[PDB]
Amino acid sequence: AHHHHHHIEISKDENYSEWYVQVITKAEMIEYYDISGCYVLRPWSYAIWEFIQEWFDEEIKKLGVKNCYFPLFVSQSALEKEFAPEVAWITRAGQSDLAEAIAIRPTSETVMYPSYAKWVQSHRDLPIKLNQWCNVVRWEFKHPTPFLRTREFLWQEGHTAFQSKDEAEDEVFKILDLYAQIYIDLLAIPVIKGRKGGDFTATVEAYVPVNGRGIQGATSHHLGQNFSKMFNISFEDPNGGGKIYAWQNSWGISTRTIGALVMIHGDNCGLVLPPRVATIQMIIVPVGITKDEQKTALIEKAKEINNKLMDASIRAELDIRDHISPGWKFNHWELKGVPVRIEIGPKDLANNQVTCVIRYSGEKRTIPIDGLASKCKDMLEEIHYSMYNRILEVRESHT
Template sequence: MEEAQEQSKNALKKAQKQAKAAAAKAEKAAKAANVPVVGGKKDDSKEIIGITVSKEGNFSQWYQDVVIKAELVEYYNEISGFYILRPAAMHVWGAIRAWFQERIQAMGVEEASFPMFLSKKSLEKEKEHVEGFAPELAWVTKAGDKDLEVQVAVRPTSEAVMYPYYAKWIRSHRDLPLRLNQWNSVVRWEAKQTTPFLRAREFLWQEGHTAHLTEQLAEKEVLEILELYAGVYEQLLAVPVVRGKKTENEKFAGGYWTSTCEAYIPTNGRGIQGATSHALGQNFSKMFDIEVEDMDKNKVHIWQNSWGLSTRVIGVMVMLHGDDKGLVLPPRVAKIQAVLIPVGLTAKTAPEDRAKHLSKVEELRGTLKKAGVLVHVDERDGYTPGFKFADWELKGVPLRLEFGPKDAASSVVTYARRDTGAKATIPLDNIATEVPALLETIQKDLYDKADEAYRTHRLVLTDWDKVVPALDSRNVVLIPFCEGPECEDRIKEMTKSENQEVGPDGHKLPSMGMKSLCIPFEQPDGLVKGETKCLNPKCSALAKSWTMFGRSY
């Protein structure tokens, strides 16, 4: 018995020694990587809360770490594939919503709200459209303990919910245009691996659905909305996009044609669809019998559009701008644009000096607030300045302002940019003008850096043998293409690579062939219609356009 107790004590001592060594190693790693530890003070546990993998070394795990540790999302553990959007993420979405809503209202788009459920009968009216969503439909079959007589699905999109009422409300050309938009969530029960923002089973979006008398009026709106989507990316999120048209393979199911803005992620060279604006033609008006009398009293089917932008935009922003320290937020969508941190105050600082200094800090906060800056003062006790710096860097705050007794004596505030790490000072008398100007500079520099990366990795190729090497070097490519659906399927198979990415769980992901991203509206020179052959060596057709291809999300 005594021998067993002695063995137990020895095992406990050994475990404690190992735990102590592991804690010391973690603390050393945290210091080396400049990441904060919980608490940031001596007596707290040493669990690392910063980013512990590099963006280049393990991009997938890096992304998961950033969105969680920067407090954008939390996993909803009750049901897989669902996520809680935290205040920092909702602020970004709110900024996008306010910007976009103001502009579509100016176009005459009105806000509405339709139910989230749709009947099986309604779905059967639009088989071609619903076919693509069928594997992802979530069905409600019970109410309490009773089976429903008619099953209902949770909306994956709202055409089948809304268009029966368009048929009821639209009777004459005088009822047109009808332009409605709703901000809501939709459910698509993804079978693939889900990822916060990029692929979730429920996500927030806006969906606009409009009706017009003529094809020309409808087409005009499609491109106006696309330009607003590009504005969300480029003006708010500092993300450059390519505007274009989807191929037949990639267009909206049941639609006439689809316009898109396509972004690019330099870290893995993948393209990602940003937002789409669809010309539905008369397909849905014929399905739902939406007819009007035109000015000559002829019965005609209306022309419709639909367009949508989702919280995927936040994921694109994170992947593009973030770094090994964490999130990097463009100032125009940041919940906190500048964090003001009092420094240089120690236990030896006299109470009256501390009070005087903090009073000056509060004065600076008021000045910045009046100048329109979203500013936060970090006065947390017991945390070192180094911990605070790393914490706000992790959360992506664009600008850090440090203010200590030496700064006060020199009548300056010291700043550090989140995007570049550059440090300098600003005279206190100038902060109301220089801080907003600096935030705008950060916004522009983030965009310019991303735009340069996109432009230099968008290669125009006329040699098929260079395509896969270009993809493996993290590029997207513009190639002469016949736009044929079967040819596109072959290209996807022919460009699968032996180079495989590693997923978050450490397993290799299947190699990915390239698919069409869009037919850019801005076409390179050099393609002669009627003469230039499709670049696919197994295709004998002539090219219709330069089409942008790439590996994609």
């Protein structure tokens, strides 16, 4: 099976739910697990989350947010301050039954806010801006789907507290725009910003052409003073007003991002990676291979190109495995969605050129080796915006 060619066995436009399973399995993104609704994130899909993590982590740090880590556990009575058929319960640990069951966090408000109440002694302690990258568990009763609705998933959740409503409201929309940027500028997915235990909730919605539905892609909550009154997160007003309750937001985005990417950009040849989150942006494949002197000169030139592409900060890799055919390589990296295949054979070598095959469109482009690296940087940008505009044109048609 591994060293054999592979086909997406059903068309996206015929049965998208079965097509979806084909793509995520044949592109080596997940493994099914014997605990239902949990899925292994294989490196090919986990790398996409790492790119999102690295980007968003840099952006919120510019806003003053610091990372932390709160516990996985919340006691039953602490959870039930302020859904119940979605909680996993620990009732035994070590050698003893617990007198009170412990919940796995489905979200961390009731884990974090007793500490926020302790940390806020005066307005000088505000703002508090904390984020954590972590796993949460929701025993989802709707049917689980890899990435889109899983019972364990990875996310970040940010939890912020301010001395005034206006600071908090301003951050809600900055965060919301950062979430839109993840979809638009990292995943090439157009989104709409909209207002859905808080004062107001805003999401980014990603339209899915094949079924006409919208993916709730991330959530930004303005909690007002609802949680700060619940947990007594308060300070003395400097201007005589007495006890003032902190103004709070929380916000989160998950590995559902990766399911949106599959649903929207996947096609009948398999995954199509948005270039900015592709762990391999360009795969270099030797083609048309006799002569010992020729095979060396050709592989040596491929190594040169590979180094020149990485010098230009392109994530290029070379596939010079000889126990497997070029045609198998084409198919493997197509199924996995590598944005560009660079083919180099004897004919192209003699013309000091390569042949680039663009995955999302199938276009073949012959390019001189001279200014190649710069031409490839441009091409990866071209692909990103073309992927985006193609979905945007589909959405602005149905709407």
